[PDB]
Amino acid sequence: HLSRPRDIVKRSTKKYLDEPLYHRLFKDGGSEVSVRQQLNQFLKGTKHVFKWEVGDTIKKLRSRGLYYPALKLSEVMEHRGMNKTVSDQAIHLDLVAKARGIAAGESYFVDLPETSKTELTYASLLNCYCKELMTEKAEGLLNKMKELNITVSSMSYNSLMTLYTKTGQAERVPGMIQEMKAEDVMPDSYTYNVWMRALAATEDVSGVERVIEEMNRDGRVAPDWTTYSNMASIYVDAGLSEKAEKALQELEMKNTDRDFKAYQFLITLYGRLGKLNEVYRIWRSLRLAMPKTSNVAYLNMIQVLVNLKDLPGAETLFKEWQANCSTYDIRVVNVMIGAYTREGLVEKANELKEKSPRRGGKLNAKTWELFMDYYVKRGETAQALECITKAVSIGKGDGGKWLPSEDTVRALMSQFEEKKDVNGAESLLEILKKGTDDVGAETFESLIRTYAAAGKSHPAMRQRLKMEKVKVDKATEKLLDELC
Amino acid sequence: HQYQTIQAIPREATGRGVSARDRTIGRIPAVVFPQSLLDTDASKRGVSRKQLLTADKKQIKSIIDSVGLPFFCSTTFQLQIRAGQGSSTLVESGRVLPLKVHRDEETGKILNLVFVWADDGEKLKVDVPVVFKGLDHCPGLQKGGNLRTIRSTLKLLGPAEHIPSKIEVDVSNLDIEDKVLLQDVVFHPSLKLLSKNETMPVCKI
RNA sequence: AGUUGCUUUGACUACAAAACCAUGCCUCUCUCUUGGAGCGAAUUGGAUGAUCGGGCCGAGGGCAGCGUAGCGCCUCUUCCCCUCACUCUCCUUUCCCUAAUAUGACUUGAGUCAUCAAAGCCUUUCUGACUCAAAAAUUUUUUAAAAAAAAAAGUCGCGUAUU
């Protein structure tokens, strides 16, 4: 056709790729390593691509959080001769801020030419400010835009409102919506969504009934399932049930594209309400919308079923996931691991722990956290020590460090008080020392008295000055300076 | 154990593509209803508990390999309906008498199931094939005669509690050119026939 | 001195949607590419009941030819296929509607804009996966010791009975 001459089916195979780039980069999987390997193999080749092909590739790589390969492809293909326009420069600015940080994004914006510093680049930098929560520089961009008469779109106002909601100054939203209505700016559905969220955050449930009637009066915005998701979340957190069911049934009517996240929202909202029959009603629709169901829907479903106490249904779902799983997801195991430790059927939890790494799932930290929860409920402390050591050795799955909860630490130390396990208390303190540099809220401030078994340590209040100036209760130093 | 229990799952989406997708999963569509819905008169079409079902492939095939194919419409089962697969909660329960399977003539895979509720005291018509026992010991068969299979099924009308899954006769006492009528067939005295028996046997040598 | 290299190579498609509350352990743990659940229709279905018509098997007495068993003619209705009502729960062929199919809706009229060391090699060094070397672990065999080995699941088929 004359509309689209650069067709991807009829194009030459000697010059161009045999399959589209957004199909080629995802051949070996969606993993970071496989995407990087595919990009490295492609950039060394002698086959070429289209500009719209690279644009859709950038959007697909951005849509799954793959920011480094998207930035690398954009930089290399611009270096090879593909000229960025203003829109492509806005997308590249957002990609730079996503990958190398806002300090790199600011330098890219400065090094941009002057005729490229238009409303698209300004709005992209504003969004990259609000997503990184820098209120002062945000407002410094805002008054500069208002001074230079750059057209402020609804996207910028929604970005500021989401920034206000996340920072905690959520009372500014009702002033700002009337500001953007006074400045002749029509809103979108996300404007009503953040307005509703700020109104519910202001402890005002009765205000969300006058906004829905106003957008019904407007007649210009299309209501979407995200609106009803916000209504369902606000009502379920507020305890109202029938209005939440009406919102969720309207949500089910609005989900015409069979969205996986929307189905997850139905499942978790009906699970938090507690209605098992309609939970299974949406679940059968989910199995009718995707036969090869991913592990995320199982992760939601089995957690909902065990929070609604359907344990043999969860056990049959486990066998279904076993017989149809391609990746042995450890979180699926770890849901019923914590289930079997909470209801105490510990032999089957131990069997799953043994059989997971053979089938191909290595243990993360939360399984050991649930087992030390089990051991701190049943009073065995040595096995809680053996669990917390392996938990801090594994650490977090995103590169963080695992730290035990304050309530569990407090209960474990109260258990240490009775048995006079000074060695156990010292090992727990050493573990917390390795975990964190601070180590103290209630950890040892009133907990010198575990030394009241036989003698005490040497330093006499000088060790307690070492760990960054802690302060103890007034009724704690008396048995300390009695024993000197 | 005496009778079989059939676990079922409800249905809400009906159609050819949805049925083929349920069979892609391995679930077979089905229905359950009382008999009063099947009457021609809407006056006798009363309060009908018509309901849609889906059935597990492994359980249906296990029952079929257990009991046999053409005897399926005679025997009764206990239907248990639950909200989800393997749920600890039940919706309803009862006894049912099947009348219809759907199977493709190529591979024989089960395609549809038709189920009729069989509550206490319900009078239902049924077509039961008969079973001949004592073949190897029949003196007419041993001496040179042959047992001609005349009639296959008989019509029975009676309670849901006491319908036999199979009809047995004794043919070990027949010499050659001997026949046994349908009135000599061992069956329940409270059970009625509604069949044109007349001067016809079930078997003859 | 002669050959081969050094000798540039690309894009032009118009595109800010990158701002999200739920469960949250890195919640898409890896989704590239799937027709519809339209209250939508036409032939077909049929989970249903009889009439009319046609068509086997068969049941007796017999006219009929034997010491059991007959060949044509003669009284019969079950059973099947149609037909008229009820009829949407499985199946075949189509048609409409929706979704999807990469965005949006003259000046390369012989141009404008980028690129102008690519490809190798050798030292380090951060982080992942695999082969493992070998030991501790558990089973069998051999005489507490020495040799070899699986652990966890799905699928097909056979014979046989415990709610």
Distance from CA of A46 to the nearest CA of B (A): 43
* Phi/psi at B98 (5° precision): -75, 155
A269's CB contacts (< 8 A; 6+ apart) are A229, A232, A233, A236, A244, A248
Tokens of A298: 């199982």
A419-424: list long-range contacts, CB under 8 Å, 24+ apart: A419/A381, A420/A450, A420/A452, A420/A453, A421/A381, A421/A450, A422/A450, A422/A451, A422/A453, A424/A381, A424/A382, A424/A385
Nearest by CB to B89, which of A281, A287, A310?
A: A310
Cα(A186)–Cα(A218) distance, integer angstroms:
10
* Phi/psi at A187 (5° precision): -95, 165
Cα(B154)–Cα(B167) distance, integer angstroms:
9
Task: State which H helix or E strand residue B188 sits in.
Answer: none
In sequence order, what DSSP letters do the residues of A210-226 get, joined into one string? Answer: HHHHHHHHH--SPP-HH
- For nucleotide C16, the protein residue with its alpha carbon nearest to C1' is A120
- Write the CA distances from A378 to A375, A415, B184, integer angstroms: 5, 11, 72
B21-26: list long-range contacts, CB under 8 Å, 24+ apart: B21/A288, B21/A291, B22/A288, B22/B54, B23/B109, B23/B111, B24/A291, B25/A287, B25/A291, B26/B56, B26/B57, B26/B58
Chain B touched by A283 (CB under 8 Å): yes
Cα(B57)–Cα(B109) distance, integer angstroms:
9
Query: Helix, strand, or coil here: B148?
Result: strand
Q: Which amino acid is at A175?
A: G
CB contact under 8 A, B85 and A317: yes
Q: Contacts of residue B89 in chain A, CB cutoff 8 Å?
A: 276, 310
Q: Contacts of residue B12 in chain A, CB cutoff 8 Å?
A: 281, 284-285
Buried/exposed A68-84: b ≥16 CB within 10 Å, e otherwise: bbbbbbbeebeeeeeee
- Chain A window 440-479: residues with CB closer than 7 Å to nucleic chain C are none
Q: What is the 3-state secondary structure (H, E, C) of B150-171?
A: CCCEEEEEECCCCCCCCEEEEC
What does DSSP say about strands B27-33 and B77-82: parallel, antiparallel, or unpaired?
unpaired
Tokens of B106: 């190529």
Spacing of C-alpha A178 from chain mean position: 31
A300 closest CA partner among A260, A336, A267, A270: A267
In sequence order, what DSSP letters do the residues of B81-142 get, joined into one string? Answer: EESSTT-S-EEEEEEEEEEEEEE-TTT--EEEEEEEE--TT--EEEEEEEEEE-STT-HHHH
Q: Which amino acid is at B63?
A: I
Method: cryo-EM
CB contact at 8 A, B34 and B109: no
SS3 content of chain A, % helix, strand, coil (to 5): 65, 0, 35
- For nucleotide C86, the protein residue with its alpha carbon nearest to C1' is B40
In sequence order, what DSSP letters do the residues of A386-453 get, joined into one string? Answer: HHHHHHHHH--TTS------HHHHHHHHHHHHHHT-HHHHHHHHHHHHHH-SS--SSSSSS--GGGTT
Return the bridge partners of B148, or none.
B204
CB contact at 8 A, A467 and A429: no
Angle between helices A67-79 and A86-99 (to 10 degrees): 140
Torsion A324-A326-A329-A333 (CA) sign: positive
B157 closest CA partner among B137, B198, B133, B187: B187
CA atoms within 13 A on the CB side of B87: 20
Return the bridge partners of B169, or none.
B132
Cα(B57)–Cα(B111) distance, integer angstroms:
10
Cα(B33)–Cα(B48) distance, integer angstroms:
7
* Phi/psi at B8 (5° precision): -130, 165
| A401 C-beta neighbours (distance < 10 Å), count | 11
* Phi/psi at B156 (5° precision): -130, 140
Q: What is the CA radius of gyration of chain B?
A: 20
